[PDB]
């Protein structure tokens, strides 16, 4: 009864072609309707192929718009490009001017950093005296800032690096004066040594003064108080030989989201002394989608999770991972991995015997060359690894799923104007704020005398050039939001499938139930 059951189906069915094929009277009609059905089916299959290819490509939809929801004021990190304090530097210079032998200077000072510095330098003095004309580049590499950072306790370096009270003259945010010991947080950078991060404090203060729409500060950044030697002398720990930031004067300014670690060596802006820098912030917000549509992460694979995630940190720790894997040591210019901490710096030199303080023996020279080779290994890995897409993709570093970013307008003006307004600025710094009297203390008197001589009223036109002003403000209150979204949802897929199926063949799922009922009836044939 196959023909009879198919005829019963054709009598009561909603399919468009099958009843005409089954009930066809002419054989030519049957052929025509079979061809019509096959053409409709093939066209439907092709259109579904394209539709499902689009769906399983998992496209993304991106909107760019300005929104009124405000961002919090960004964290501002300021680093003086000079690593050490001016009085400490002058003391070191004068100490070498009275005795050029660093060994004899170990017990000449009660400052901890000076004793450590003299002891570290003394390990290299005979080698420098005997081989500076044969290996100048080696000694320039080894007397860099980063070797002292790697080999002296940062809590000892912090006693000689730039101090907050001697760096920030004035600070204003949201119409009130800053509380320096409350709002500035000190952190150590292997190249800049002491750096300070400002965290905004909203009005609760009675000190109603300053910029209302942003942050402004006056910074002592020049080096004009330092002694001018009549001939060139080696002062280790000051110059990062042939680094792109080496021997520069000014302030390094980093604008970054609040609870994030800054990386002043590879991000931020430069400000020269004697200038006023305006930073016009345009805030941005990027929202991203997960694995099938893209890649984004909410946490750093290498971190402990205390920081707010930034891709830069992940990439830097990936670089450190590969450096540690290849050279067997860590680079001071990158974070140390929170996994292991028994890893030594590549620039470590505690291996040096104390006899190298007295003799320029071949063993000391070989150790010097080995340290140079370790530095070269680290530098080579740093230069090569970021071009290697396999290694970089193996670290699973993906952009944050909800990222706040800033576009900064940058411009400069000569801050202390010649003439009367410069007089007013000088009086504000030294008459009202009384900048020098911060150093009228038993432990800082020498610096007090230095600043009293340098910043006297007569020499103001030249001496005020050592200051720089930063003016950081939000230019546009609205945030430019870039949001990812899935372009082709499952509902859109279902609707398009319905459209295609209605256009070509006219099937509905209730009609697929017709064919299922026919199949069960054939099972009962």
């Amino acid at each position: 009864a196959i023909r009879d059951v198919m005829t019963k189906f054709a009598e009561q069915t909603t399919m468009h072609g099958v009843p005409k094929v089954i009930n066809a009277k002419s054989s030519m009609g049957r052929l025509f309707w079979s061809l019509v059905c096959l053409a409709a089916g093939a066209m439907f299959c092709l259109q579904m192929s394209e539709v499902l290819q689009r769906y399983f490509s998992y496209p993304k939809k991106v909107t760019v718009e300005v929104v009124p929801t405000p961002v919090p004021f960004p964290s501002i990190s300021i680093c003086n490009m000079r690593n050490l304090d001016v009085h400490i530097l002058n003391t070191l210079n004068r100490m070498f001017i009275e005795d050029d032998r660093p060994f004899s200077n170990i017990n000449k000072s009660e400052h901890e950093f000076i004793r450590a510095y003299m002891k570290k330098v003394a390990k290299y003095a005979p080698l420098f005296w005997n081989y500076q004309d044969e290996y100048p580049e080696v000694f320039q590499e080894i007397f860099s800032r980063t070797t002292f950072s790697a080999n002296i306790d940062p809590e000892v370096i912090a006693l000689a690096a730039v101090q907050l009270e001697g760096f920030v003259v004035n600070c204003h945010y949201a119409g009130h004066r800053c509380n320096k010991t409350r709002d500035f947080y000190r952190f150590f950078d292997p190249y800049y040594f002491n750096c300070f991060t400002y965290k905004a404090h909203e009005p609760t203060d009675n000190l109603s003064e300053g910029i209302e729409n942003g942050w402004s500060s006056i910074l002592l950044s020049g080096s004009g108080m330092l002694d001018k030697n009549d001939e060139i002398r080696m002062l280790p720990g000051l110059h990062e030989w042939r680094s792109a930031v080496s021997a520069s004067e000014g302030v390094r300014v980093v604008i970054h989201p609040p609870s994030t670690t800054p990386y002043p060596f590879t991000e931020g802006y430069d400000v020269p002394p004697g200038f006023s820098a305006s930073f016009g912030i345009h805030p941005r917000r990027n929202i991203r989608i997960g694995p099938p549509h893209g890649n984004c992460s909410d946490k750093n694979p290498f971190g402990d999770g205390t920081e707010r995630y930034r891709l830069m940190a992940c990439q830097k720790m990936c670089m450190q991972h590969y450096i540690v894997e290849t050279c067997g040591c860590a680079d001071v210019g990158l974070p140390k991995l929170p996994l292991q901490a028994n890893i030594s710096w590549c620039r470590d030199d505690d291996n040096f015997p104390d006899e190298c303080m007295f003799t320029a023996s071949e063993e000391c020279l070989q150790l010097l060359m080995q340290l140079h080779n370790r530095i070269k290994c680290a530098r080579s890995i740093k230069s090569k690894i970021t071009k290697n897409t396999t290694a970089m993709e193996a670290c699973n570093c993906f952009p944050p799923c909800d990222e706040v970013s800033y576009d900064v307008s940058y411009s400069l003006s000569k801050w202390p104007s010649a003439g009367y307004e410069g007089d007013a600025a000088y009086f504000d710094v030294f008459g009202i704020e009384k900048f020098n009297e911060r150093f009228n203390k038993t432990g800082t008197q020498g610096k007090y005398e230095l600043f009293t001589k340098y910043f006297n009223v007569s020499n103001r036109e030249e001496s005020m050039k050592d200051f720089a002003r930063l003016n950081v403000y939000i230019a546009d209150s609205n945030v430019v939001k870039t949001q990812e979204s899935e372009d082709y949802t499952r509902n859109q897929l279902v609707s398009d499938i319905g459209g295609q199926l209605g256009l070509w063949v006219g099937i509905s799922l209730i009609t697929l139930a017709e064919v299922l009922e026919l199949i069960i009836d054939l099972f009962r044939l």
């Binding site: 050029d100 032998r101 660093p102 003095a125 500076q132 002398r233 080696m234």
Partner: peptide, 4 residues
């Protein structure tokens, strides 16, 4: 010759 360079001195310290």
């Amino acid at each position: 010759f360079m001195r310290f």
